Specification:
heterotetramer; A: about 15 residues; mainly alpha; 1 helix; rod-shaped; B: about 220 residues; two-stranded antiparallel ribbon; about 5% strand; binds palmitic acid; dna binding protein; rxrg; steroid hormone receptor
């Protein structure tokens, strides 16, 4: 997954 | 360059500015992984890579990128490290907790050398951007692009060292030749972290735990 | 420079050009043989022999693994999907994978051999990079780290003047050469860990000089 | 000791 890293990278706002 | 301005790399650095010392270090690493993603996003062209390639570069580099930061943060103190949490770890605490060896390698191979040459934040930023743009990182969709980004960063760094330190013709060489030490220290810190995880009895927070997960 | 001539560093590389089925046995055998040659190479590097005996021991103990890996990697630029040992034996990728050492072998091919091949790294450049590895001012126990530091500085000033003179169209060539040293360090460390396991488990002949290098500092 | 390495380095031959 690498859930957290994916969520932080995607997040722009 | 205009492709890879040293201004933007400096702006990225400035934008992010339990007795057990190992617990405190692990807690600080977890917090700084959140900041590290925001730092990478401010490095020119990083965010234009595919999400998969961004993940691969941050997973390969996070350890060296954090060690480079706390080492440069610690040039103000004698025989200790300053964590991003504002906590200080003295050499004597590190030795007392069974991580004297690696702590001394950090002090001798990185902190003291950064201190000796007075490495500035533009130079640290560039060296961190070179570590980030690691064309050897396994599974990259396009190693060539990462290679050219690394090349743009080291062209930018060299023009910066020639412009700012014209009297030190060896300075560029000297900066690049801390990267092997940083790699070796990175690998030894990783082995410590895997042991801490394996044995338990050191709390490891979710983001640091994720970085230690073996796909 | 006059204090660290690139001619002498090339002469050291030219001076050491050479004349079972487990690839791991074959590689360990070649490593023992090349440790003998490595001492002779070090002695031909300007100023190395003027260091104290203790400091010479420290630098060759700290560097031998990297120094041998640089040499066989550069020897292997002409080989498809394999390495050429100093013994004249070839090790193909398929054998390495079949012997349980595929990952590290692929790292050697991908991070070192293919990159040396891509930039066509010459023997003067290899000699310099090996002399930089040798003059490791971070090596523990050095009587005078400062003088090792200045020898490293003389080598990288000599390398950079050589790359500017010979490859004036490749402004980044110097940087590119120095930026194979982190990979060499990383690969070095993983090879060492392999060697210690081969020793621990037995079932690999390990000759006297390689055995000695694996005996604790 | 580093017996071999010492013998090889000392030798000037
Ligand atoms: C420094 C030597 C301690 C040895 C313990 C191993 C811990 C792994 C090191 C990972 C980097 C820590 C990140 C700290 C974050 C910061 O404050 O900038
Ligand atoms: C070559 C990498 C794959 C094998 C992994 C085992 C680790 C062996 C250690 C490397 C020593 C290098 C010896 C080279 C000798 C030569 O030049 O022929």
């Amino acid at each position: 997954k690498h859930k957290i890293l994916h969520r932080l990278l995607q997040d722009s706002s | 360059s205009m492709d890879m301005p040293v201004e933007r790399i400096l702006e990225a650095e400035l934008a992010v500015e339990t007795n057990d010392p190992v617990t405190n270090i692990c807690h600080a690493a977890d917090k700084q992984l959140f900041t590290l993603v925001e730092w990478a996003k401010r490095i020119p062209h990083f965010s234009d890579l595919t999400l998969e390639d961004q993940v691969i570069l941050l997973r390969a580099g996070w350890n060296e990128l954090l060690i480079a930061s706390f080492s440069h943060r610690s040039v103000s103190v004698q025989d200790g490290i300053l964590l991003a949490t504002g906590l200080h770890v003295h050499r004597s605490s590190a030795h007392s907790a069974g991580v004297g060896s690696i702590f001394d390698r950090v002090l001798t191979e990185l902190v003291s050398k950064m201190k000796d040459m007075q490495m500035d934040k533009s130079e640290l930023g560039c060296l961190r951007a070179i570590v980030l743009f690691n064309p050897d990182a396994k599974g990259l969709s396009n190693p060539s692009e990462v290679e050219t980004l690394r090349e743009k960063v080291y062209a930018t760094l060299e023009a910066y060292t020639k412009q700012k330190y014209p009297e030190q013709p060896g300075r560029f060489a000297k900066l690049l030749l801390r990267l092997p030490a940083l790699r070796s220290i990175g690998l030894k810190c990783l082995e410590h972290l895997f042991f801490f995880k394996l044995i338990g009895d050191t709390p490891i927070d979710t983001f640091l735990m994720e970085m230690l997960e073996t796909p």
